[PDB]
Design a binder for these strands. Structure first.
Ligand SMILES: [Mg+2]
Ligand SMILES: [Mg+2]
Ligand code: NA
Ligand code: NA
Ligand code: NA
Length: 312
DNA sequence: CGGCAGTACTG
DNA sequence: CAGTACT
DNA sequence: GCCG
């Protein structure tokens, strides 16, 4: 990134708007920052600034103050609440509205939350794993967690396919959590496994807490056996084989990649989800056949991108 | 002016 | 439903 | 915040 001196200031304002709930302004900042991060040259002109997609007048103006001044004055006026709102919304299950409510109620520290706040079941689990959930794990450990899930799943039906998606599949050296997609080529035997599979993982001691337990998605907490291990977030999704390519695509991400591809699909009168790519979408349409990820790219008129170049 | 991805859970 | 979360 |  040629524009660290720019984007590092912008990131502070983006995070500030985010934790304060100004989601769309933060979105604009987030995209500007990637746009700036993916420019070849340092931005050295206001008009050069407006040249890059995702940078407007207001944003070029800030990039200008940074290069002429070395600083961005708006940084000096960020509310004193922002570090606390960030502290609070880093609890899994607490977002901006909960953080703002806790702040208005006078809480300022996790000790205040622990001792005085009313916590949802999810938030109490998030709080007890506060540090662990802020840490990314080495890739090798994500491999171990995926293989733990796969072996428990293959014990029940050997035909079950399990693949770790998310940052793992995009090839990253560290992973925030582990994202495992499960299906079955029979198109049928994926059904009803969760009860058995989760109980198998739980009976082993691997699964330590459940956050979400849906008919298709599980979000929870695991910890590998032995010393020196931290608790890690684990997401598992079980899908029908007919949806495998769109489910793989969604679950591999990145999030910004998914949103950009879904926006593209919408411009073309299509709709893309983790269930299907649909066409003739009136704004339900027809589901288009997508046996592989490449089919999704092709039907959208895009060159195929391997998971590693989806890391937007 | 107004969308900015589309969906699944929770209570 | 509003809130939060997954990519 | 940006953009159609
Ligand atoms: Mg992940
Ligand atoms: Mg995840
Ligand atoms: Na631009
Ligand atoms: Na949170
Ligand atoms: Na207090």
């Amino acid at each position: 990134n040629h524009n660290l001196h720019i984007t590092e200031k912008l990131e502070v304002l983006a995070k500030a708007y985010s934790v304060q709930g100004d989601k769309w302004r933060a979105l604009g900042y987030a995209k500007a920052i990637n746009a700036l991060k993916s420019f070849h040259k340092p931005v050295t002109s206001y008009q050069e600034a407006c040249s890059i997609p995702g940078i407007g007048k207001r944003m070029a103006e800030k990039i200008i103050e940074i290069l002429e001044s070395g600083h961005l004055r708006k940084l000096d006026h960020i509310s004193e609440s922002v570090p606390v709102l960030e502290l609070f919304s880093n609890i899994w299950g607490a977002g901006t509205k909960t953080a703002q409510m806790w702040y208005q109620q006078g809480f300022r520290s996790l000790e205040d939350i622990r001792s005085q706040a009313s916590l949802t079941t999810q938030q109490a689990i998030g709080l007890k794993h506060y540090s662990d959930f802020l840490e990314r794990m080495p890739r090798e450990e994500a491999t171990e967690i995926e293989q733990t899930v796969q072996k428990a799943a293959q014990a029940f039906n050997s035909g079950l396919l399990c693949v770790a998606c998310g940052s793992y599949r995009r090839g990253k050296a560290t992973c925030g959590d582990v994202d495992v997609l499960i299906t079955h080529p029979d198109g049928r035997s994926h059904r009803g496994i969760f009860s058995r599979l989760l109980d198998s993982l739980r009976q082993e001691g691997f699964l330590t807490d459940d956050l979400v337990k849906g008919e298709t998605k599980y979000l929870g907490v695991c910890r590998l056996p032995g010393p020196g291990r931290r608790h890690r977030r684990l997401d598992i999704i079980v899908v029908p084989y007919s949806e495998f390519a769109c489910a793989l695509l969604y679950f591999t991400g990145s999030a910004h990649f998914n949103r950009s591809m879904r926006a593209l699909a919408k411009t073309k009168g299509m709709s893309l989800s983790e269930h299907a790519l649909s066409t003739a979408v009136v704004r339900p349409g027809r589901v288009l056949p997508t046996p592989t990820e490449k089919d999704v790219f092709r039907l959208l008129g895009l060159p195929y991108r391997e998971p590693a170049e989806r890391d937007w």
